[PDB]
Design a protein around this ligand. Sequence first.
Ligand code: DCT
Ligand code: MG
Ligand code: NA
Length: 360
Amino acid sequence: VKKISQYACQRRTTLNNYNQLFTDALDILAENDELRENEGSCLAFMRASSVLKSLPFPITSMKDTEGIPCLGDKVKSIIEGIIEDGESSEAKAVLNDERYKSFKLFTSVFGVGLKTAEKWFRMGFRTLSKIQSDKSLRFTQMQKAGFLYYEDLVSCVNRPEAEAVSMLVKEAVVTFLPDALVTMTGGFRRGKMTGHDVDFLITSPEATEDEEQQLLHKVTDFWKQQGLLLYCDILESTFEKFKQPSRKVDALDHFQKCFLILKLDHGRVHSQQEGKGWKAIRVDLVMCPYDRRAFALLGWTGSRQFERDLRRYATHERKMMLDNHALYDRTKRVFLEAESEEEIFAHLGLDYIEPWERNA
DNA sequence: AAAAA
DNA sequence: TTTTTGT
DNA sequence: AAAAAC
Ligand SMILES: Nc1ccn([C@H]2CC[C@@H](COP(=O)(O)OP(=O)(O)OP(=O)(O)O)O2)c(=O)n1
Ligand SMILES: [Mg+2]
Ligand code: NA
């Protein structure tokens, strides 16, 4: 009987999606607008898809869309077409578009984003084999790893694999920092069965500034000694307790982090042919100062749409500024502290949304 | 593309 | 109508 | 560099 909010942070979105026919089409249309750099149309299709994912029933008529926010005329035409014959002519045209197909294929490589994919398409490349064998192209260390471990990285990480990775991370971390708190974040924290990677947040209540800085180096050196580190990139912290973010679009937070590819031996997975006996897994580790742990956990849990709307709600409804490191109140002119995610939600005047309810 | 200012 | 859309 | 990694 209540009104569905336009904000994902005011909706409970579990993995039980009753509208996959509509949201799969809307996700394709959004992805195409992202590729065509049409940010506004992209966001409108992402918001429409997100709200339909929150519904406790499937849409079976146009009357069912009444009172649902983020569904304008364009989105309602797409829903009408899917109700008509079970297909989206708009999404079908995108799936057959050469630019869209090439972008999906090229960006599926680790180390290849929008700019490199667009460059290769405009050069006339259409297959990964023709890219890899070209004698004029030069590849980054990230792309070399992306091509070498391609098949493993494109097959998604399942729950037994994520759990096996969690054990490896926790065992390595507590060996060097016994009081450290390790939390698996991302999709797996939200209850997902699969993911493109396994993400972790690491924090320590008693570690020194040096101990905190050295942990990622100690843990990765230990794995390097065991020949388990297939790719490793450690980004030093640029965290400053009172500095403003400076960048209008900063994809990464300022905490110390590492982007890894780990060699996951089959014997460690408690879940068929064996093969090489191991699988390459994308793993991200984030180290944050103990007092920022709630902001970092909230930002790394996701989903991306839940994070966007949290920040949008904070700005437009509360005149607050939120990020992975802090929460600032522009009216009271004070930073708001939090020991848990619950305290962040309470500062924002939001009902607490459980991690498994953040799948917007 | 949709909603707010 | 013009502005905003996370970061 | 730009670009990529969330
Ligand atoms: N544009 C983005 C990308 C990521 N994140 C945050 C929320 C998720 C977290 C981890 O990023 P991903 O690994 O890409 O997210 P995911 O939710 O874990 O999905 P997947 O299960 O595919 O790894 O970082 C975000 O706020 N905004
Ligand atoms: Mg993830
Ligand atoms: Na990529």
